[PDB]
Design a binder for these strands. Sequence first.
DNA 1: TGCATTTCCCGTAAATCT
DNA 2: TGCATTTCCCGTAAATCT
Lengths: 559, 559
Amino acid sequence: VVTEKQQMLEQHLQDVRKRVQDLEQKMKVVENLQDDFDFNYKTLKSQGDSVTRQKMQQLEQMLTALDQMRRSIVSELAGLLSAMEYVQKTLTDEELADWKRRQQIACIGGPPNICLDRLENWITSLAESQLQTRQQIKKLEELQQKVSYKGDPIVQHRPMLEERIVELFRNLMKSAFVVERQPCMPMHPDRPLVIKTGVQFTTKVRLLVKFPELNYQLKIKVCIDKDSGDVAALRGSRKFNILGTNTKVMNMEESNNGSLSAEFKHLTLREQRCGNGGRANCDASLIVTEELHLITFETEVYHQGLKIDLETHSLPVVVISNICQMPNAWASILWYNMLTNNPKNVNFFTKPPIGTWDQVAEVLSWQFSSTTKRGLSIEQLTTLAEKLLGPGVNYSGCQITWAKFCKENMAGKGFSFWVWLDNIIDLVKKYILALWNEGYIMGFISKERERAILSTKPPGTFLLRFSESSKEGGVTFTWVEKDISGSTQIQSVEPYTKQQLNNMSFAEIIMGYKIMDATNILVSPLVYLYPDIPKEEAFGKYCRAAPYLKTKFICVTPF
Amino acid sequence: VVTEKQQMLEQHLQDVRKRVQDLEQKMKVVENLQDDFDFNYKTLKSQGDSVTRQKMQQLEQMLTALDQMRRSIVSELAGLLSAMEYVQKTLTDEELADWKRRQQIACIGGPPNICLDRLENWITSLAESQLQTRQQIKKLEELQQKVSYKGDPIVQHRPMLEERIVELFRNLMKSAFVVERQPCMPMHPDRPLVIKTGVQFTTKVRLLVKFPELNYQLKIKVCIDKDSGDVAALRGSRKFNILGTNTKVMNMEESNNGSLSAEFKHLTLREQRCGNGGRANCDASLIVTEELHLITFETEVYHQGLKIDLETHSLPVVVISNICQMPNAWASILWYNMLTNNPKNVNFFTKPPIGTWDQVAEVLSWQFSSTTKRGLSIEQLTTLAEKLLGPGVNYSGCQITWAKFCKENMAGKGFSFWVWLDNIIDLVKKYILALWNEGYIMGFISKERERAILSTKPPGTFLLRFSESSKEGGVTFTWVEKDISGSTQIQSVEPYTKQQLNNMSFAEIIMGYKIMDATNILVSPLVYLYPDIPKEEAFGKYCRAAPYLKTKFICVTPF
DNA sequence: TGCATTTCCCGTAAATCT
DNA sequence: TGCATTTCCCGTAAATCT
């Protein structure tokens, strides 16, 4: 929906249109007058060998009128130029920049609407206004070539009018060239900005100035690690090359608005082996999953007498060689986009900024509502804000470092926070996908707060959560049955590794698991998911000459 | 061990050595005599301006003696040449050819000893004998340049002596260039002659003439589909190129004998895309797994004034693009090597020859004693000779077509004989490897002959065999428990797909599987593997603040 | 050496050829 | 169309770099 500021921009853009139209009218009038004066001047010489000299008076009066129209025109153009100069800034440095920011957020799973139609409509409108304005200025020039005098306002102001309009257009064209769709592997739609060597990836650029005359006219060339893989920047980085179709003609294909776009599919990266530089120097100058690269797009436009060089680039990209590097790669992308709006800080991880728990907790939620049906409840969130910060109340402004989030392992484990969570999110797909679904799982709750269940709810009531001390990821639950039941001693079962969920689904385990107490007594799974919901309404849904004895496996704990 | 024929060849080779040595002696003598005659002749002219003319008599008598030695020499050389010509044939067309045949057999899992040391020793001996013989012939030539007369036996016979010796050597060099190790992917050691595009493969050539002078002198170039991927041969075939290090210098590296060899590692195939020809025409002119190619090796040798071009090639190779094509590819390799000794019949599958059950049953056994500890007992074999030929007694000379073996599916199934068996052999590795082992499994036995167990042996006695009606492969057993036991109604359980053996091993199932009869009655697995061996002696060997309830799964049939 | 990182490649699934 | 065949590429394991 349209904000107030966007209402205003739209209004200004129409005011600009109107002034251009008023000027056009004024040019038509001044030119007809100039034609009339030109004709009368000649007719008067056809006899310059009766009191027929009010014509001389007519001739002088027309001339005076022309001068006045010319001053008026030149004065209005200057005014229009200044207005354009003010508004173009609102358009490019504010609205478009807000769009660039929201693209960052959308990449990391945030609230989308990275729609370019409005911007394209604004940008195109202004561009049309500017070209028509340039043509008026050019007309003033040809009018002067036919009729001029001492003090002619066209001779004194036109050059500056040209310069200003060329500068506005030249700059609007450059801002209008953007990356509509960041480098991403079709196999990992939720993981843009992470490229694996050898695997195909696509990316798309757009030119927000919707000029049909330019259809199929521009050739866009893409490359990675342009020039900066030399001097006056980072050092020790791996360097890469793009394989596949390197260039692409921009066109208004695929219908939808008929926007000028250029899409590159089947692109591939390969490491550029050989050469030298250094490579070492303190922690090898950034681990591979913290090194950042830029994919650059370039072309040139020749239009109505002008040559304009256009260049744009993707957001920093992490390049990996194997998929096992994806989790850390993603953490770098999360962190970068979560905390900076700088679109080309390739050195970002030299000294990474610190985040607040607020910003990190939002990001973590998105990572769930991406791959799945829904995010994270505070019951899951807060009891994870603890995992990183232990005891405490209200984490609002609590700082979280890159080290704490991903670069280093958690307090007493051999793996990092993010990698552990990424493994959950993974697992909660390949298996238990459907089962995670809407709200059937607690997932993140400390044994202490986990005690506040059977300790307050009736025997049978269970709760669902993840393996908190395993790298690859696992899932479990709660129940009370053993010995003589002192005061209901809460229990859990050894985590099921990915392989363990290939045999039976988690809700198949919940709805089909007894307990072999002592001997022969094979009791049962416990009723009522946490509040008071009997297991069935929630889990009973994801369940399902001759012969040979048809079979099915079950585990069931044997003490 | 040395056959009688090999004893003889060795003997002939030594006779050849001896004659060369006797000739050398004879050359030494004739040359000293020629020196003496030459000297005396001059001494006699130093006075040809006392009865000092018995010297003239001495001079003539020396000359006569020289002529006689020369006739004798020329006569013995001709004789040696003929002997060499006879023996070289025994060496190249018989012993070496037998070695080429045994290489075929070894490739398809047969009885090895494809050892080249003997051949190399024979070949090298003959080569040395021939070069020394060539040098004598050359010496006769220089002797003639100094002393000649009318009827000189050197002038009349030498040219033919040269021609014959050059021909023998030139041909021995060519036969001596062989493929010691056929194209094979290191990842599939039991599958030589089957190459997958993109995957590395190695191959090695040897030059059986062990001349140290040639160390590091020859450059061997390898290629695939040489010239024949043009005219006067097959048509519609895919064409390929070799990627990686295309050439390799031959040397006496890796110690062992110091044989001249050249090994190519990290070779890769890629389809040569584009062009034309036809491609279609009747069944697309051979399915991809029946198309055959040749990897050719070439080099040239310049030695002691001779230029000799050497060329050799691998056995026909099948080129696949995906591993799922391996089973059919292998069947083509089996069939080819089982039934022909032609080393370059690329059209073989145009009209494939027919095999006898004997030859096929041997081959099938090897395929087991390759990947595993041991082959196939007739109890398994014969009851598989039936699967292909049904009812019958003594299959000795029963014909088996390519269609029946692999090209077409079995009678009432959607898959072929060989592909089914290859899947067993596979399965009997990834899982049940250890378990297949020596003699614990029947594996192949028709329900009819399978009845001759509990129908003669006491309740409990079980038998082990494979899923006869599943493409991917499976395993099962026998036992009697259900209803009220009419007369012990033999039973089996639904086959366990590859995934089903990832949870519990087959012998873990045998030693840990009860039967849930009616309700709560969970009986047990049956004792005594087929004869009278209690399950345990055979299968019991492959079996094996806090906390969390440690777990293990079991299936057990629930009627 | 052990670590960080890349390469190798099967096997499943999707794409392409015919 | 459905079939034959190749390409894509994850993920496990081995190789290489440092």
